[PDB]
C-alpha cells in the first residue's frame, strides 16, 4: 500500500519544531490580539481594546467603518437593522442580505440557499438553522467592531508579511462574508471574492454539501468560541536557485496510493493545490483538492479577504487552521460526513500544529507546453518558494505532504510534477510524502524512479539537466505527446551513460 521510507521515520511538527520566539507585532507582522494575555484555553483578547478604522487602498475595508455609506446613511446601521430580524423562510434571509446590497438585487441568485433550506433539509434541521445557527451567526457578525479592533493590512503583491489573528476574529469575519457585508468587494479585481453570494447561486448538487460543511463550522464556533490563533504569511523570494548547478542530493520519499494529505500528513507541510486566486472556487462552483480543504478548514477562507493574487515567485503559508468537518468522496461525489474533533496539538502561539502552503501550478492548455524549460523552471521555483523556510535547519523542517499538484484540470503531467516537487523539496532540504489517491501504478513509478536516481547518487542539478535533455531531444521538435515518455527517457539516458 506504500513504498519507500516508512512514514514513521519522517519529520513532523510539533516535535521537529524549533523553539518559537516570543510573539510580537512588527513592521512585517500584524498581530491583532494581546500577546501579553495569550494563555492556553482562554479566548484571546483583541488589541487594541476599542475599534480603530482604516479606509484606504492598503487595508481591508471593514463593513463597520464609519466610511461605509449608502444613499448619506451608515451602511453598518443598515446591516444591523437588516440582519436583526426573525428568519423563518429562506426568502427572509435573501431579502435581509439584499437590503444592503440593493444594486445586486437582480444580479445575485439565491436558488441554492432557498433549495438547501426548503428542499434538502428536513423540517427540524431547517428549524435549527433559522432559530439557532443563523441568529448566532448574525450576532457574531454584528460583534465585529468589538472583535476585529485592528485594521487588517492587505497582503499585496511582493509583500513579505504575516497576519496573526484569533480563530474568534476569523469567525466574526467569515460570518460577515456569509451575509455578504464586505463593501467594495462585489480596485479589488486582483483579489479573490470574499462575500459568499456565489455560494447561494444555481442548482449544483454539491451546493448542499458545501453549505452543510460551512454550517457545521459556523455551528461549532458560535456555540463555543475557539481559543487559538492562525498566522497568514505571504512569502515572495527575490532569488531562485541555479538549478543546473545545484549539487544537493535527493531527500527521502514515502509514496502511497492510500491515505490523505490532511489525515496522514499531520504535522507535515501540507500542499494546497491552489488557484493563483487562493481558495479557487470554494465559495462558488469548484470542489476539488483546494476547495475541499478550504471547506473542512474554513479559517483558510479568510485568506481571500486580504491575499492579492499570487505572482510566479509567491506563496501563502497558513499555520494553525482547525479541521471542523469530515467528508467522503471528491468533486462530483463530495459529501459532508460529520463533525471533526481536531486533535492537533497547539504550539506556543496557540496555533494548531497544521501548516498549509498555497502554491498555484500553471494551467497547460497543451500538454507538451509544460516541458518547455521556462515552464519547468517556473514550477520548480513556485514549489521551492512554497517549501523554503529561510534560516531553518533541515532537522527542524517537517516532510512535505503532497500529491499530483496541477494535474487534472490544469493538465499537468503527474510524473513530471512528482519529479519537480522532489527536486524542489531536495533543494529546500525536506523529505517528501506523496499521495497518489488510488493510482497504484503511479505510486510504483514514482518510487522506482526515486530509488533509481538516489541509488545512482544523482544531484538536483543532474536530474534537472536530464529534464532539459528530454525537452530538447524528444519535445522541441515533436510532431504529435512524444514517442518516449519522461521516465523511460531518464532510465535509458542514465543507464546508457
Ligand atoms: C488530491 N486528491 C485526489 O486527487 C483524489 C482524492 N480522492 C480521489 N482522488 C483522485 C481523483 C483524481 C481526479 C479526478 C477527476 C476529476 C473529476 O472526476 N471531476 C472533477 O470535477 N474534477 C476532477 O479533477 C477524480 C479523482 N482526494 C481526497 C484528494 O485530495
Curated annotation (Swiss-Prot):
Q: In which tissues is it expressed?
A: Ubiquitously expressed.
The catalytic site is made up of 272, 290-291
Which catalysed reactions does the entry list for this protein?
A: [(1''->2')-ADP-alpha-D-ribose](n) + H2O = [(1''->2')-ADP-alpha-D-ribose](n-1) + ADP-D-ribose
According to the UniProt record, one GO cellular component term is:
cytoplasm
This protein's record includes keyword Mitochondrion? yes
Q: Where is this region: Catalytic?
A: 150-330
Q: What is its EC number?
A: 3.2.1.143
Domain description: The PIP-box mediates interaction with PCNA and localization to replication foci.
What quaternary arrangement does the UniProt entry report?
Answer: Interacts with PCNA. Interacts with NUDT5.
* Name under which the protein is recorded: Poly(ADP-ribose) glycohydrolase
Q: Which gene encodes it?
A: PARG
Amino acid at each position: 500500500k506504500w513504498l519507500g521510507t516508512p512514514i514513521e521515520e519522517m519529520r513532523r511538527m510539533p516535535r521537529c519544531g524549533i523553539r518559537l520566539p516570543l510573539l510580537r507585532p512588527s513592521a512585517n507582522h500584524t498581530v491583532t490580539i494581546r500577546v501579553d494575555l495569550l494563555r492556553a484555553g482562554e479566548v484571546p483578547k483583541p488589541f487594541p481594546t476599542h475599534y480603530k478604522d482604516l479606509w484606504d487602498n492598503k487595508h481591508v475595508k471593514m463593513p463597520c467603518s464609519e466610511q461605509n455609506l449608502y444613499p448619506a446613511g451608515s451602511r453598518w446601521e443598515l446591516i444591523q437593522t437588516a440582519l436583526l430580524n426573525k428568519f423563518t423562510r429562506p426568502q427572509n434571509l435573501k431579502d435581509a442580505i439584499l437590503k444592503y446590497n440593493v444594486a445586486y438585487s437582480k444580479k445575485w441568485d439565491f436558488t441554492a440557499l432557498i433549495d438547501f433550506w426548503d428542499k434538502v433539509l428536513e423540517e427540524a434541521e431547517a428549524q435549527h438553522l433559522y432559530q439557532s445557527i443563523l441568529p448566532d451567526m448574525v450576532k457574531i457578525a454584528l460583534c465585529l467592531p468589538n472583535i476585529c479592533t485592528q485594521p487588517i493590512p492587505l497582503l499585496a503583491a511582493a509583500m513579505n508579511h504575516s497576519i496573526t489573528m484569533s480563530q474568534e476574529q476569523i469567525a466574526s469575519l467569515l460570518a460577515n462574508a456569509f451575509f455578504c457585508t464586505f463593501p467594495r468587494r462585489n480596485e479589488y479585481s486582483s483579489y479573490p471574492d470574499i462575500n459568499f453570494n456565489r455560494l447561494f447561486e444555481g442548482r449544483s448538487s454539491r451546493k448542499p454539501e458545501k453549505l452543510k460543511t460551512l454550517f457545521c463550522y459556523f455551528r461549532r464556533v458560535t456555540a463555543a468560541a475557539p481559543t487559538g490563533l492562525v498566522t497568514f504569511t505571504r512569502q515572495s523570494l527575490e532569488d531562485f536557485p541555479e538549478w543546473e548547478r545545484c549539487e544537493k542530493p535527493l531527500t527521502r520519499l514515502h509514496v502511497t496510493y492510500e491515505g490523505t494529505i490532511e489525515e496522514n500528513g499531520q504535522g507535515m507541510l501540507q500542499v494546497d493545490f491552489a488557484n493563483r486566486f487562493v481558495g479557487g472556487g470554494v465559495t462558488s462552483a469548484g470542489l476539488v483538492q483546494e476547495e475541499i480543504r478550504f471547506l473542512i478548514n474554513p479559517e483558510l477562507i479568510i485568506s481571500r479577504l486580504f491575499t492579492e493574487v499570487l505572482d510566479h515567485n509567491e506563496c501563502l503559508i497558513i499555520t494553525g487552521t482547525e479541521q471542523y468537518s469530515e467528508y467522503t468522496g471528491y468533486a462530483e461525489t463530495y459529501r459532508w460526513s460529520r463533525s471533526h474533533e481536531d486533535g492537533s496539538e497547539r504550539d506556543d502561539w496557540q496555533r494548531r500544529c497544521t501548516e498549509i502552503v498555497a502554491i498555484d501550478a500553471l494551467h497547460f492548455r497543451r500538454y507538451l507546453d509544460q516541458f518547455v524549460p521556462e515552464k519547468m523552471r517556473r514550477e520548480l521555483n513556485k514549489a521551492y518558494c512554497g517549501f523554503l523556510r529561510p534560516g531553518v535547519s533541515s532537522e527542524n523542517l517537517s516532510a512535505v505532504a503532497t500529491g499530483n499538484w496541477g494535474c487534472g484540470a490544469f493538465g499537468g503531467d503527474a510524473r513530471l510534477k512528482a519529479l519537480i516537487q522532489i527536486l524542489a523539496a531536495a533543494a529546500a532540504e525536506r523529505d517528501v510524502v506523496y499521495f497518489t489517491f488510488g493510482d497504484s501504478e503511479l505510486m510504483r513509478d514514482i518510487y522506482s524512479m526515486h530509488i533509481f536516481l538516489t541509488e545512482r547518487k544523482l544531484t538536483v542539478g543532474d536530474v534537472y539537466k536530464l529534464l532539459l535533455r528530454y525537452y530538447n531531444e524528444e519535445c522541441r521538435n515533436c510532431s504529435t505527446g512524444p514517442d518516449i515518455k519522461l521516465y523511460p527517457f531518464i532510465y535509458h539516458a542514465v543507464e546508457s551513460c
